[PDB]
């Protein structure tokens, strides 16, 4: 969280939290109910976001659902959208935590090695992740859509 990241700095210097550190915890926690609402809306529309993300993805790059494609077939496709469902979930976690610690340990550190092994085409995956931003963002107010958008662009960034 902001807490985990920051307290760690306190303990490492053998000290209590600074006025600054205390202030950011206060400003952060004040922004709680809104972040929880952003996660709820997206949790509530998860199946729509994934499915419409999946259509947007295969238009922009179909070849993956074709004879020599990593996602070719009904159960090779059941897995690609499932991975898209995984990342949307992690994005809701990140938004409520206010940073990436959780998103990172769960789904980016090691992701190059995992996908290289599976020879899933990773760079297509970034575009797929990007599509979810477009759908999710259309179910949120301008201000909340931006706040959500940072976490989508992070994942897009980490797969790089």
Partner 1 sequence: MQDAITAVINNYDVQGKYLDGAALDKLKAYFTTGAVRVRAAAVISSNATTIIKEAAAKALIYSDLTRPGGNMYTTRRYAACIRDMDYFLRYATYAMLAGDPSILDERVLNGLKETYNSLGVPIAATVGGIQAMKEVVGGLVGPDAAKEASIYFDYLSSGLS
Partner 2 sequence: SRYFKVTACIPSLKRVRTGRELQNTFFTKLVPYENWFTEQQRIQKAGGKVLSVKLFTGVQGANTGVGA
Partner 3 sequence: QELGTPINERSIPEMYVNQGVPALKRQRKVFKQSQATDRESFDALVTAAYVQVFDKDIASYIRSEFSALESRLRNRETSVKEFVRLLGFSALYRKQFHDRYPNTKVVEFAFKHFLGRAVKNQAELIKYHGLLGRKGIKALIGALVDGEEYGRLYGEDTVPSWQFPTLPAANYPNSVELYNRFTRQDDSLVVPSFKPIRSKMDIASMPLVQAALKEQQATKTALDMSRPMFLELGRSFKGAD
Ligand X SMILES: CCC1=C(C)/C(=C/C2=NC(=C\c3[nH]c(/C=C4\NC(=O)[C@H](C)[C@H]4CC)c(C)c3CCC(=O)O)/C(CCC(=O)O)=C2C)NC1=O
Of the residues 11, 29, 31, 43, which one makes contact with a second copy according to CB under 8 A: 31
Stretch that binds partner 3, among 8-16, 30-38, 58-66, 138-146 (CB under 8 A): 8-16
State the Cα–Cα distance between residues 107 and 90, nearest whole angstrom: 8
Identify what 114 binds: a second copy, partner 2, partner 1, none; CB under 5 to 8 Å per kind.
partner 1
Give burial (CB, 10 Å; 0-12/13-18/19+) of 81: middle
Q: Provide the CB-side half-sphere exposure for 135 (13 A, CA).
A: 24
Residue 38 or 124 with smaller CB distance to ligand X: 124
Identify what 41 binds: ligand X, partner 2, partner 1, none; CB under 5 to 8 Å per kind.
partner 1
Inter-residue contact 39 to 103 (CB < 8 Å): no
144 annotated as a binding-site residue: no
Residue 27 contacts partner 3 per CB under 8 A: no
Inter-residue contact 102 to 90 (CB < 8 Å): yes
Buried b (16+ CB within 10 A) or exposed e, 20-38: ebeebbeebeeeeeebeeb
| Contact footprint for partner 1 (CB under 8 A) | 1, 3-4, 7-8, 10-11, 14-17, 19, 22, 25-26, 29-30, 32-33, 36-37, 39-41, 43-46, 48, 86, 89-90, 92-93, 96-97, 101-102, 105-114, 117-119, 138-139, 141, 150, 153-154, 156-157, 160
């Amino acid at each position: 969280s902001v807490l985990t990241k920051a307290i760690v700095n306190a303990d490492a210097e053998a000290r209590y939290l600074s006025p600054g550190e205390l202030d950011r915890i206060k400003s952060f926690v004040a922004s709680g109910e809104r972040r929880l609402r952003i996660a709820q809306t997206l949790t509530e529309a998860r199946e729509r976001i994934v499915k419409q993300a999946g259509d947007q993805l295969f238009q922009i790059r179909p070849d993956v659902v074709s004879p020599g494609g990593n996602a070719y077939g009904e159960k090779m496709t059941a897995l690609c959208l499932r991975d898209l469902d995984y990342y949307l979930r992690l994005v809701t976690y990140g938004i409520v935590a206010g940073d990436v610690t959780p998103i990172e340990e769960i789904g980016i550190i090691g992701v190059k090695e995992m996908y290289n092994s599976l020879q899933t085409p990773i760079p297509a995956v970034a575009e797929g992740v990007r599509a979810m931003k477009n759908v999710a963002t259309s179910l949120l107010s301008g201000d909340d859509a931006a706040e959500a958008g940072f976490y989508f662009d992070y994942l897009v960034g980490a797969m790089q």
